Amino acid sequence: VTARLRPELAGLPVYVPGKTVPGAIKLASNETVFGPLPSVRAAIDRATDTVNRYPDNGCVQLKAALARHLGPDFAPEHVAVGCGSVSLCQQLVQVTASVGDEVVFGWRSFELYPPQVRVAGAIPIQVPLTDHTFDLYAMLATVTDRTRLIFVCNPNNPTSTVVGPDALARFVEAVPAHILIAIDEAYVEYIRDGMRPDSLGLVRAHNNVVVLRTFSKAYGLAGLRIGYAIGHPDVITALDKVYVPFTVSSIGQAAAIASLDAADELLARTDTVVAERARVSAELRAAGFTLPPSQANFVWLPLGSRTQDFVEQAADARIVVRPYGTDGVRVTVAAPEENDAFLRFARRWRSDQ
Amino acid sequence: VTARLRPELAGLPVYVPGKTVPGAIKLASNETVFGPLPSVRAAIDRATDTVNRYPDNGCVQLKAALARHLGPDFAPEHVAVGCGSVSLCQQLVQVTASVGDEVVFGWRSFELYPPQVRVAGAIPIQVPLTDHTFDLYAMLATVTDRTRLIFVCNPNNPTSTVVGPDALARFVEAVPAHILIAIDEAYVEYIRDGMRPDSLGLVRAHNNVVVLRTFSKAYGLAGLRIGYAIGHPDVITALDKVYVPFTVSSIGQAAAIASLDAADELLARTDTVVAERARVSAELRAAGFTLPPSQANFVWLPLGSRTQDFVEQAADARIVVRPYGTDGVRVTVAAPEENDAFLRFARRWRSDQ
Ligand SMILES: Cc1ncc(COP(=O)(O)O)c(CN)c1O
Ligand SMILES: Cc1ncc(COP(=O)(O)O)c(CN)c1O
């Protein structure tokens, strides 16, 4: 006899992380390539002095720094902080959804969403993409009385694309006002070409809109786990009710504050990533690959049934890229020498096809 | 109109942390008082270089070290790691309980249990203590067909006591074998007087027993959030299914590994805390305070309706102690000079009654 566990656990689609392989360049987790700035390193060591003490459960000084960086329309009451935006995704489910409820999102999208929804006893409504892009029209139509939460992943992980900014505004305006809408903006700092939506204006104009952002990519703290949500104080308060206490570490909070102080410097680096993104995209298309327009720090190769082969052969060339079933491969844009290694491999692989 | 949130959120008993008051003596969060060893800071220093990279989702190195420390009868498959044992408490609830299900625990016990149970839509069965100690007989009598999880907090937070080690074994033997029993051993390193149970023996003897331990107290890493569970590989596999990805940070893992390597030095320090505990207990009793026999790094003062006054008066003396309703005050055993400052206050307060 064994302990009786919940029946939902069997076949639960557990999250599978990007691999780390000795000897290989990693283009599978959308990480930026630079270690911490001197001031960030200093804050980590300063926080290390008092590691025997619990963190601030409320991340008070971080919220004050985030509110200031968000501008005059936002105060700390509009900000929740979580142990990665992955934690905030679960907290959103925990404040909205229970047994038999529905959570709507585009698919393929962040692989985190389905299992977290299922843990709540709710059902994920996975709405197909159109041209590798969230289909807001289709998502709206599938709303029912039991729809408790909607995720819009923008830019989308793993397809890299963004919806039209005006289209997003129309969507939010059309959704029944009682349904929480979470706009996942993990990659927002990489959006160019006038495609960034007025996400903060949407949270101002609508009490049911919450925006998720992260320190893991542009701010370079994927190792330390700081995500934040921007929303209406009632929603922020609810998220803080289900927050697992102390999960955002002291060192994480201090490192995040120091990163905010260096934001001009850190955000300027995204311009370089975007330049490589354009170059990687141009070279891949010149080789004969087709891929959608990326607004993130990665590209999406919809290789279908060939994704497994591409990834295995990439591994043989000491390059780690990220497979998504039989849909495609997500390739991070990183250092120029890593991007060149990937491009050389990609040309060679497609020639062999 | 506001976003519709779950009804269970209204009046949820949200976890209230111990206050942190700059300039005051903090005896409110059961923290140890020493900064990290140079070897631990060095491990953090090395990990700081790659904070741009995600942590190991599987905590492979840490699990291996934990399994070595647990001895020849335990391998990594018996160990789950969480972002604090507080996260593992939620994971336990997530693998066992949903709407209508029951979770039984002694009360007063860990403030964390009721809200996490309610977040699952489950029903907390709160079984009164007897002489400030878990009443295993009464808890057994409360078991039903809907009992999905049992918490035994040993030593108990906040009352500081343990049940008899044989009584614990008999309780485990008498609980129906399909019900998961979690033994919360956050303070196990402080148990003396032959009162420590054979919890690892119980795990080996029973597939439905899981033991929770932490790096936050004896190992002095409260700021960095590492807890671990020891159990049957099926339970561990299940806990890892609901684990929020990457929540145990890269720096936390490195610090925890370093702390295991320095376990002889760190564990030896528990003897000094134990000596202070006996000393403080004698000083309080001589000053007219009754208290149960503590096996933790804190004592429990069953002040009843006077706890608010005691805490307020302590606060005015620049001493932070932890109030629990109209039941009592939990006071951490910390540095000798800090304990003496508290004792001075305690004697003063006593004389004013
Ligand atoms: C859309 C999205 N949201 C959240 C996350 C998780 O980020 P964090 O490291 O802040 O948890 C990811 C990971 N790439 C993502 O793609
Ligand atoms: C019984 C018990 N369990 C778990 C915890 C949480 O410890 P951690 O810091 O590992 O989350 C505490 C905190 N005092 C506790 O008292």
Residue numbers in the entry:
A (entry chain A), B (entry chain B): 1 to 353
Question: What does the original paper state about this entry?
Answer:
In order to decipher the structural basis of their substrate specificities and to provide a rational, we structurally and biochemically characterized two 1β aminotransferases from Mycobacterium tuberculosis (Mtb), an HspAT, encoded by rv1600 (mHspAT) and a putative phenylalanine aminotransferase, encoded by rv3772. However, experimental characterisation of this aminotransferase in the current study clearly demonstrates high catalytic preference for Phe, Tyr and Trp instead for Hsp. Therefore, we propose its reannotation of as an aromatic amino acid aminotransferase (mArAT). Contrastingly in mArAT, residues Val86, Phe110, Leu112 and Phe246* form a hydrophobic substrate binding pocket which provides an energetically favourable environment for the specific binding of hydrophobic substrates such as Phe, Trp and the less polar Tyr.
The binding of Phe and succinate in the active site of mArAT as observed in the crystal structures of mArAT-PLP-Phe and mArAT-PMP-succinate complexes revealed the molecular basis of substrate selectivity of mArAT. The two liganded structures are virtually identical (an rmsd of 0.28 Å over 305 Cα atom pairs). As seen in the one of the mArAT crystal structure, a dicarboxylic acid, succinate was bound in the active site pocket. In the dicarboxylate bound form, succinate exists as a non-covalently linked moiety, forming a ‘twisted’ bidentate H-bond/ion pair with Arg322 and Arg330 of the C-terminal domain. Succinate essentially mimics L-glutamate, an amino donor. Utilizing the structural information gained from the two structures, we traced the plausible conformational changes that mArAT undergoes - from accommodating a dicarboxylate to creating a suitable cavity for Phe entry and binding. Thus, the first choice of molecules for inhibition studies were the dicarboxylate molecules succinic acid and maleic acid, the latter being a well-studied inhibitor of aminotransferases. However, both the dicarboxylates failed to inhibit mHspAT and mArAT.
